[PDB]
Amino acid sequence: YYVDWKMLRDVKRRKMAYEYADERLRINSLRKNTILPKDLQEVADEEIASLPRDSCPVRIRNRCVMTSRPRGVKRRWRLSRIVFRHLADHGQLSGVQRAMW
Amino acid sequence: AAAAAAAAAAAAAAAAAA
Amino acid sequence: SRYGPEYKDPQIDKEYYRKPLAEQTEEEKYERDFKKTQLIKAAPATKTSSVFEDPVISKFTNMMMKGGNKVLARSLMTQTLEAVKRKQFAKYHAASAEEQATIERNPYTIFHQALKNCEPVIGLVPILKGGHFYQVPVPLADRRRRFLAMKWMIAECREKKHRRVLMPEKLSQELLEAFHNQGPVIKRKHDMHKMAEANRALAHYRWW
Amino acid sequence: RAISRTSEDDPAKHREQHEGQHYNISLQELKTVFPHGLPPRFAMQVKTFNEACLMVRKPALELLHYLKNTNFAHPAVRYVLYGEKGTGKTLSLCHILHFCAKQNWLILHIPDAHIWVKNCRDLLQSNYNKQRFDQPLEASTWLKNFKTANEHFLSQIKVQEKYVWNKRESTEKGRPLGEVVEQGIMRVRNATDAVGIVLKELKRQSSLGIFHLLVAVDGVNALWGRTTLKREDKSPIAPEELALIHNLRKMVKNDWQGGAIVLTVSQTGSLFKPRNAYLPQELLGKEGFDALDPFIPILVSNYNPKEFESCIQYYLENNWLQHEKAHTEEGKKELLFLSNRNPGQLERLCAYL
Amino acid sequence: LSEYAVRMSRLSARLFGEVARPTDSKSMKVVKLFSEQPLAKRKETYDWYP
Amino acid sequence: KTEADMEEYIWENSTSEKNILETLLQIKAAEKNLELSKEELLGTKEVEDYRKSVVSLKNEGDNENTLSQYKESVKRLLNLA
RNA sequence: UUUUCUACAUAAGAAUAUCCACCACACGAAAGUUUUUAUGAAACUAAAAACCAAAGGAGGAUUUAGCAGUAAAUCAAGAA
Ligand SMILES: Nc1nc2c(ncn2[C@@H]2O[C@H](COP(=O)(O)OP(=O)(O)OP(=O)(O)O)[C@@H](O)[C@H]2O)c(=O)[nH]1
Ligand SMILES: [Mg+2]
Ligand SMILES: [Mg+2]
Ligand SMILES: [Mg+2]
Ligand SMILES: [Mg+2]
Ligand SMILES: [Mg+2]
Ligand SMILES: [Mg+2]
């Protein structure tokens, strides 16, 4: 079990987005190019908008990995701010400490 | 305009580059 | 307060240190100064050993300064002193030997005298009594008075000039007009003095 | 004890051991010799003292001494005054200018070249010159100063050309040049073409012994530099594109005889140059220095001890130092340090003192 | 700018293996796209969750 | 190869070369000397001091001593002492 | 007006709601309209141009902050 249904959704999304990365890239090559004619690019356009909607990366969310919180995340530990503090304050995060200066 | 010929293959085989 | 209360203010005066041997109590005093192993605050960037710097000019400079610009305010002061100077050199050569003996060309003495004339004698403080606020005549400290002078100068020559007109121009004008006591600044001083006579009875409400 | 204004005034006869003394000039002398600009700070100096007094400096002496031995048969010689900001270049150009107005030459003076390259309200288009722009205001002003500059020679010159101002107006050869000058003053529209015409006919008529031409261009770097002014397309224009500059370039080429061109390379008015660059090749660039030919690179430096003490004494004589403690040696040490005995800096420090 | 400079530059690109023929600002993106690891392929992305 | 492409300032085919040859052409036309050659003019020691001074000025850059070299070379060339 | 623009570090040149007969026009456009660009499958999102140039002429009762490298003003970077 992932902690939340939402997290589940996200796992799927990352899987699909991993699978179609090659197709998406190859097509958006054509799409993003001035050199090729527009007639290729409109077909290529429908091509990439044909692809399953959950395969596109912008639909991914970086979520807290233990607690599933959608924001207030620190990218480095993939941790919610709350869970991060909870680990660091027991000193289970090496080299992390309160800051005085 | 000007298209100049650079030989990939010559310098390739010569320098162990192909 | 990055200085502990232990730290004394520095004495920048060169004349004080150069010629010690004629004064007993002061020899004893600065003996006790350094020999006390007394810490000294580092001399500020504004203040110099310069023979040319007038602490009053510097104060005024500061009160003129908006934001962080010393460069700009020191500019405007410099320009104003130069402007008073040249205004009096103009008034000198178009005059006759008598008036050439009379007229003052030192812009510094003009600045000082014009401030001395503009400083108020007496002042007003609001005092609450029986749910009413009466304005009461109050004697003022020296510093308060000098302050009132400088602040009134600057407030007027900021406020009342026409937008085309530059600052050192208007300021040199008002300096010279306050030198001769006819300036609007001086009228303000008098408004205070008259408001202070109108209320003189209320001078009893002051408890200090 | 120091000597200041005690030099007897002879712009030509100035002696090497008279160094650092202030000779005196009249006011009508000031109106006839400098109808064009005199540096604003110094103009303030004059108007304040009622006396125009000028100190003799070593580069001015040197450049006058190269103007004594001038062989007018040889092609025009190019001189260049260079130095740090506020070191007295333009006053050293003025020394020359009035000495050579006293020998009765034709004085052509541009106070700042930069003014033609920057900040122009009206920019007019002219295809007469094959896509060139003109500056009516500037041209007019320069002409109006040039009229008062030299009157005697404006009647004497005979212009040989057929000149067309308008379809309805013209001026044909045999005319005194004054008529051309004032014909360009009156009509502001064509005043620039009038300046250019004045210039090229000056250069043509300079071969004769009737003409001794001193051409003084201050801030010559404004000629080959980069220009701020813009077309309605917002696209910037070359200095070539400017009629006034295009013609004022021809005046420096040394193609002609009887003349001398004394130039000054500037910072204070420049465009796109860094503030710390006083050196000739940096300010002039590749175009400037390459098209400037072999020239004489005269260096202008700060006051030496004697020059300095003389200037201070000159200020004390006018009682322009109003600070009580400025009469001490202390005050002199302080002014020397704070100004680094640089003339412009010293003037600034003594202005508010 | 000269023809010499442009010939030199063309030679530099061809040599070091960067883009030979002149391209738009807009088309260079293509090169970028294959120079990199596409976002959904990075281990920081598909491997994010335990 | 363009001359604006150069890493050095070579005295041959320069602009200063043409300005000097025109200056000396006009100096010879003024002195009423009918002697005219490029070999004669450019072969002199003066134009050689000008080679050295202008190549040291363009390559090395503005300097005190380099402008002293310019001073001397152009002094000699234009006959002023 | 201790301003606005350009050059440029802090000595410059110009502009300056008013000139005058007549427009035109100062400071203020962060807003809108058009066209581009970046990101993205998707532009409604951000950015740059050009046009446009409005209210605002220093603010009633009442109110906030600051004890020194502070207030004030200016510059930069980061997190997502
Ligand atoms: N009496 C006298 N004063 C001089 C002389 N040279 C410089 N000064 C003073 O120093 C100021 C310098 O003026 P400039 O001649 O314009 O100096 P500059 O080298 O042209 O300075 P920039 O234009 O900024 O390059 C003058 O206004 C004078 O007050 C001089 O020869 N005689
Ligand atoms: Mg739950
Ligand atoms: Mg997202
Ligand atoms: Mg100057
Ligand atoms: Mg506007
Ligand atoms: Mg603004
Ligand atoms: Mg797109």
UniProtKB/TrEMBL annotation, chain A:
GO terms for cellular component: cytoplasm; ribonucleoprotein complex; ribosome. The keyword Cytoplasm does not apply. GO terms for molecular function: structural constituent of ribosome. The keyword Calcium does not apply. One of its GO terms (biological process) is translation. Keywords: Ribonucleoprotein, Ribosomal protein. Belongs to the universal ribosomal protein uS14 family. This is 28S ribosomal protein S14, mitochondrial. The gene is MRPS14.
Automatic annotation (TrEMBL), chain C:
Residues 45-200 form the Small ribosomal subunit protein uS7 domain. One of its GO terms (cellular component) is ribosome. InterPro entries: Ribosomal_uS7, Ribosomal_uS7_dom, Ribosomal_uS7_dom_sf. Pfam families: Ribosomal_S7 (PF00177). Its main location: mitochondrion. It is found in: Mitochondrion. Keywords: Mitochondrion, Ribonucleoprotein, Ribosomal protein, Transit peptide. One of its GO terms (biological process) is translation. It comes from the Eukaryota. GO terms for molecular function: mRNA binding; rRNA binding; structural constituent of ribosome. SUPFAM superfamilies: Ribosomal protein S7. Belongs to the universal ribosomal protein uS7 family. This is Small ribosomal subunit protein uS7m. It comes from Sus scrofa (Pig). The lineage of its organism: Eukaryota, Metazoa, Chordata, Craniata, Vertebrata.
TrEMBL record, chain D:
The keyword ATP-binding applies. Its main location: mitochondrion. It is found in: Mitochondrion. ATP binds at M55, G86, T87, G88, K89, T90, L91, S266, T268. One of its GO terms (biological process) is apoptotic mitochondrial changes. The keyword Glycoprotein does not apply. GO terms for molecular function: GTPase activity; structural constituent of ribosome. Mg(2+) binds at T90. Signal peptide: none annotated. Residues 6-21 have a biased composition (Basic and acidic residues). It comes from the Eukaryota. GO terms for cellular component: mitochondrial ribosome; nucleoplasm; small ribosomal subunit. Residues 1-21 are annotated as: Disordered. Belongs to the mitochondrion-specific ribosomal protein mS29 family. This is Small ribosomal subunit protein mS29. It comes from Sus scrofa (Pig). The gene is DAP3.
Automatic annotation (TrEMBL), chain E:
It comes from the Eukaryota. It is found in: Mitochondrion. Belongs to the mitochondrion-specific ribosomal protein mS33 family. This is Small ribosomal subunit protein mS33. The lineage of its organism: Eukaryota, Metazoa, Chordata, Craniata, Vertebrata. The chain holds residues 46 to 95 of 148 of the full protein.
